[PDB]
Design a binder for this molecule. Structure first.
Ligand SMILES: *[C@@H]1O[C@H](CO)[C@@H](O)[C@H](O)[C@H]1NC(C)=O
Ligand SMILES: *[C@@H]1O[C@H](CO)[C@@H](O)[C@H](O)[C@H]1NC(C)=O
Ligand SMILES: *[C@@H]1O[C@H](CO)[C@@H](O)[C@H](O)[C@H]1NC(C)=O
Lengths: 188, 188, 186, 181
């Protein structure tokens, strides 16, 4: 009877977003919290039903308020006495399904070593902006770090080159990742 | 242009694991190492005119000596034991490729590269073989080159003329590999 | 500066809670975690920030509602997860399996096969190879796609001989029967 | 001679720009680094962000402690300023370069001293800042510094790249060329 991990991670930080909550079953994300609306947002449609559950409304509020307190009261004191931990994010881009030309597919931009959790993601086609399908899902991981996923729907073609461009919003550091057709599969 | 730089280095030297350990603190003014604390000597010692005052003074402070005498255990061994899994125990496969310069023509001299990249640690053995006989002669290495990201890279070039009936093999052996890697060249 | 309060529940397929931890971090430093045996917050950090870790423990320990909350924490997990936990442990998506050649690497072999496996969940999967219906030794953990599906692949280097038939054998719970994909040079 | 050499606190502070640094290194490779005026602590690789095992935060204090000592050494030496050594610049790709296959160019700069330098990537004479990554100052046994700059790119036979470095040890900005065949 194997074990599974349910992770409830409330985090807050200097700058925006000033606070955030991420729940996850094993590695993958179930909900992220929208505080302005005060409710769970499901990662997938199929989780919609249990986003309403309000058993822990108070517990969450407590944590949020405390976590925030830590940032506001402590931190201005450590400011300069202690160095603000940060990583430089790592991006890699890969297709969701095996590459076949002329067949619709999806580029995934997987951001890792993200800390602090403050970013925006942008796609480019031959160094030309391109609107990315859907939002950018940030998620906390074991180790007190974070990761993010962004997707782009496209139909791959031989000459294609794509790039994913991550902007770490503290100091606007940019981190890129290129993608090109590599070892495409025959169609049958 | 007027600038002054001060450095300090708390070096730890390990052999046979943690068996023998030498702790060496070095104090630098600009590029001049003016004084150092060598565990094997037990005392601070002025190396240059600049270090005489500090050398004598710091030896007078017994709290300091003892503190920096345990550094062997409290600093070197302590951190070694902590990092081991991700430092000494770090092993990353090389990516081996073999290609020729100047597109190969029969009977004309050429150089074929054995490029070996992305591996760690940097200690590696690379050899050339022609029809099973280890060809040592006309061999040029670059030695391990640090990429600055915990990976090394090397290229070993062999002088040869592409005559038919000759097959060239680059043979790479490395700590990360459970069995040496071989790559072949054709020619035509 | 970033801070965490990480509640993590560990439960089996049945829904019976096996562990519960509640931890407080600052600047990516784990400072203090709940200690049930002691029924209070206990600093996990004995270094530069230890001072702080103590401070935070006390500020939290004088909180009363929290103390009952955490003492019954193991229950909360089972109670909170109850509705969906069965659906998640029942969740499985079938893997797609496609086999084709790919550029060889770290091999003297002229041909390299790739067994692609995607769109599957959970991540637990097994991939082996057969040459004319007999086991062989391949030349990894699945890559999450962030959308509750995983992909991975296996490789096999070889020399082609027309007659030979190579087969990729995938097995995954989200599929009812083993999946086989073949390949022949020709 | 030794099997391994760890160095825990190769650190420096220099008068110019009141800059300074505190790092841990193992076998000439860096685990993390603290920059003084950024007041940041950065781990070179994700695995070194554990904090159990690899705790920075001692930095700044290390920089503070070492800075304290500067002013006196300065006057004790009859104000012996730092000399400007010329750095040597190298450029090469991280993995094998194949046309169209994405890759990373690496600018490597040795014998940097003092540690006050500009390094910039150029594509066809145009400066490139988007997606570039660089290290803090790495250390040399002779007590100079190293530095790494990284630039991801898609090799094409249509463009060239230059890594231009500017140092007081140079008469004018020198740039190191690279292009595929
Ligand atoms: C599940 O977790 C509990 C507590 O950590 C442990 O005692 C038990 O052995 C685990 N079971 C399995 C199958 O891993
Ligand atoms: C190396 O260390 C091992 C275990 O500590 C010990 O058996 C041996 O004495 C050491 N060998 C040498 C050459 O020092
Ligand atoms: C680096 O570039 C900036 C802007 O051009 C300049 O202020 C500074 O003098 C340069 N530093 C060096 C060492 O040349």
């Amino acid at each position: 009877l194997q074990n599974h991990t349910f992770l409830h991670t409330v985090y807050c930080q200097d700058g925006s977003p000033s606070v955030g909550l991420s729940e996850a079953y094993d590695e993958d994300q179930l909900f992220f919290f929208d505080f302005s609306q005060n409710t769970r947002v499901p990662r997938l449609p199929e989780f919609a039903d249990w986003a309403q559950e309000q058993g822990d409304a108070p517990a969450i509020l407590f944590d949020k308020e405390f976590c925030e307190w830590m940032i506001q009261q402590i931190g201005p004191k450590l400011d300069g006495k202690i160095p603000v931990s940060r990583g430089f994010p790592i991006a890699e881009v890969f297709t969701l399904k095996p590459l076949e030309f002329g067949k619709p597919n999806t580029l995934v931009c997987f951001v890792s070593n993200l800390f602090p959790p403050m970013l925006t993601v942008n796609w480019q086609h031959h160094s030309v902006p391109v609107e990315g399908f859907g939002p950018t899902f940030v998620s906390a991981v074991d180790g007190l770090s974070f990761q993010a996923f962004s997707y782009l729907n496209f139909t791959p073609e031989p000459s294609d080159i794509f790039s994913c461009i991550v902007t770490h919003e503290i100091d606007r550091y940019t981190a890129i990742a290129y993608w090109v057709p590599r070892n495409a599969l025959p169609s049958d | 242009p007027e600038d002054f730089v001060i450095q300090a280095k708390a070096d730890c030297y390990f052999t046979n694991g943690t068996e023998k350990v030498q702790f060496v603190v070095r104090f630098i003014f600009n590029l001049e190492e003016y004084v150092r604390f060598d565990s094997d000597v037990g005392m601070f010692v002025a190396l240059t005119k600049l270090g005489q005052p500090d050398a004598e003074q710091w030896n007078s402070r017994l709290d300091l000596l003892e503190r920096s005498r345990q550094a062997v255990d409290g600093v070197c061994r302590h951190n070694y034991r902590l990092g081991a899994p991700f430092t000494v125990g770090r092993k990353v496969q090389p990516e081996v490729t073999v290609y020729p310069e100047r597109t190969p023509l029969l009977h004309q001299h050429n150089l074929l590269h054995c490029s070996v990249t992305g591996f760690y640690p940097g200690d590696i053995k690379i050899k050339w073989f022609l029809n099973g006989q280890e060809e040592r002669a006309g061999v040029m290495s670059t030695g391990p080159i640090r990429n600055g990201d915990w990976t090394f890279q090397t290229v070993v070039m062999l002088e040869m003329t592409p005559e038919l009936g000759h097959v060239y093999t680059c043979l790479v052996d490395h700590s990360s590999l459970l069995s040496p890697v071989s790559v072949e060249w054709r020619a035509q | 500066f970033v801070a965490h309060v990480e509640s993590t529940c560990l439960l089996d397929d049945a829904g019976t809670p096996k562990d519960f931890t509640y931890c407080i971090s600052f600047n990516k430093d784990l400072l203090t975690c709940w200690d049930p045996e002691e029924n209070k917050m206990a600093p996990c950090e004995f270094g530069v920030l230890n001072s702080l870790a103590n401070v935070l423990s006390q500020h939290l320990n004088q909180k009363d509602t929290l103390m009952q909350r955490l003492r019954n924490g193991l229950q909360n997990c089972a109670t909170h997860t109850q509705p969906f936990w069965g659906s998640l442990t029942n969740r499985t998506r079938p893997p797609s399996v496609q086999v084709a050649k790919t550029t060889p690497f770290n091999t003297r072999e002229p041909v390299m096969l790739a067994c692609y496996v995607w769109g599957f969940y959970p991540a637990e999967v097994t991939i082996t190879w057969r040459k004319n219906g007999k086991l062989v030794m391949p030349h990894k953990t699945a890559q999450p796609n962030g959308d509750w599906t995983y992909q991975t692949l296996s490789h096999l280097a070889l020399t082609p001989s027309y007659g030979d038939t190579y087969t990729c054998v995938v097995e995954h719970i989200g599929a009812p029967e083993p999946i086989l994909r073949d390949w022949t040079p020709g | 001679k030794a099997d391994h050499m760890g160095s825990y606190g190769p650190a420096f502070y220099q008068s110019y720009g009141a800059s300074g640094q505190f790092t841990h290194e193992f076998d000439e490779e860096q685990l993390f680094s603290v920059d003084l005026k950024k007041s940041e602590a950065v781990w070179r690789l994700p695995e070194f962000g554990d904090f159990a095992r690899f705790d920075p935060q001692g930095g700044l204090a290390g920089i503070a402690a070492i800075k304290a000592h500067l002013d006196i050494l300065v006057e004790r030496s009859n104000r012996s300023r730092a000399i400007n050594v010329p750095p040597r610049v190298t450029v090469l790709p991280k993995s094998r370069v194949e046309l169209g296959q994405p890759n990373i160019l690496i600018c490597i700069v040795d014998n940097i001293f003092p540690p006050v330098i500009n390094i910039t990537w150029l594509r066809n004479g145009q400066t490139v800042t988007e997606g570039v990554a660089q290290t803090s100052f790495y250390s040399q046994p002779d007590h100079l510094f190293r530095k790494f700059h990284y630039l991801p790119f898609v090799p094409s036979a249509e463009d060239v790249y230059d890594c231009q470095v500017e140092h007081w040890g140079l008469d004018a900005p020198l740039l190191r060329h690279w292009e595929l065949q």
